[PDB]
Amino acid sequence: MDTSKLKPNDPRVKYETKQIRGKTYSYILGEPAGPKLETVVLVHGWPDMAFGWRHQIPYLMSLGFQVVAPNMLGYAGTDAPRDLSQFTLKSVSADIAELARSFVGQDGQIVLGGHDWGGAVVWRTAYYHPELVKAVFSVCTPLHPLSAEYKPLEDIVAAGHMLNFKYQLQLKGPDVEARIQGKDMLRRFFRAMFGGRGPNGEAGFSTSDGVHFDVLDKIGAPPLLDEQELEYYVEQYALQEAPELRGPLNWYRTRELNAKDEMDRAKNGPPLRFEMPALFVAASKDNALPPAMSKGMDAFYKDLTRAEVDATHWALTQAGDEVNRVIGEWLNKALG
Structure with a gap:
């Protein structure tokens, strides 16, 4: 299995769409070699897209995971509705839940990962749909309290x-x-x-x-x-x-x-409380989201793992291999 980063239009993955809560959602779909351990849903931020996870997708595939990386609402092949209410964290979390369950079934669970606005989405998704989220990680984006x-x-x-x-x-x-x-x-x-x-x-x-x-x-x-x-x-x-x-x-x-x-x-x-295993990966040189911002984050988690990588905001790519290792090790512990 070739684990190097996805290239543009890489043939190792599939490019599909589904109707999800009234919208066309486009996504990258990567299959593992052999029987899947879990399905991982990955959520990019601004101004990125599914391809933003090009280092992580083949790596996770080689670890035995099915990977679903949507172009989020407004991006690339996905619909951009006129109505701003479709862009709320709650509405998009519900999109993610329905997309997830179109792969794992209504009773199934997923691993959920996010970056930038995507990190904000996955914390909210784990809050709104704890049934669904077996483990969750964010890169760069710490938890913020309920407004x-x-x-x-x-x-x-x-x-x-x-x-x-x-x-x-x-x-x-x-x-x-x-x-x-x-x-x-x-x-x-x-x-x-x-x-x-x-x-x-x-x-x-x-x-x-x-x-x-x-x-x-x-x-x-x-x-x-x-x-x-x-x-x-x-x-x-x-x-x-x-x-x-x-x-x-x-x-x-x-x-x-x-x-x-x-x-x-x-x-x-319910209060903001994450019972499931969680990982936060901070980026040392992050301008927009400085690590200091994750101050008292740990109080909201039963099981939070912190990590840090030396990179700018664009840590998924600039420090792809290191981010991959951090996630891999955490996922191993979280699932085993």
Whole structure:
């Protein structure tokens, strides 16, 4: 079994869709050699896609796992609904649950893994569907408590709080959606998002201000992608109807809707408590999600394993082999 990373359109896996809760969901499906131990569902974040797990998918396949990696709502081959209520963590968790059970049956269980917004999704999925989730891991994204209040993000950062999230103001607004349209702009956007820099070292993205439009034309080749991978991201994102980033950006437009769901659960529903085995992999050089942010996370878990890898936010790829080892060892203990 070839365990090297997936290449664009890699033939070792299948590219399928299913109807899931009223939406077409596209996904990568990888089969193990021999009888499957478990099914693992992997959930990417922004601005990534299923192919973001290209290091992990063949590795997990070779460990005996069936792997299902969806392009999440709004991304690539998957539908991007107009309604923002479809993009809430709760609605997407329910999508994941139905997708999972279309593979393991209604009584079955899965292993669940996430990164970035995907990490937020898998903690919520394990909270909303503990029947289904046998073990759960997140890379980079720590647990956040159930929202007890809603304040507009503008007011939070104007008071000097959550400053490392201020880029989300730009993302939820009109500017990125309007300006980043078509393959050529998408290409520049991805060189910026994956670490490319201009002739004078200017970054194409910051956690303070978001996408630096003036820089994009001058942004060079990202260290974190080769040319073919970069082109695959462009082509898959171009599957969306222009403005192509509407779907992906809708993930930043749900704070009020999410807060409404979670204030309800904070008051009426069960407490945030994970009984099943859980893993959090922190990334040392993570700008957007610094490890310090996972402060008192351990209190919510019966069985949390912490790990750390030296990488930026893009740890799945930049530190693929190390991330694979951490997951492999944890999964071995968690299942055995």
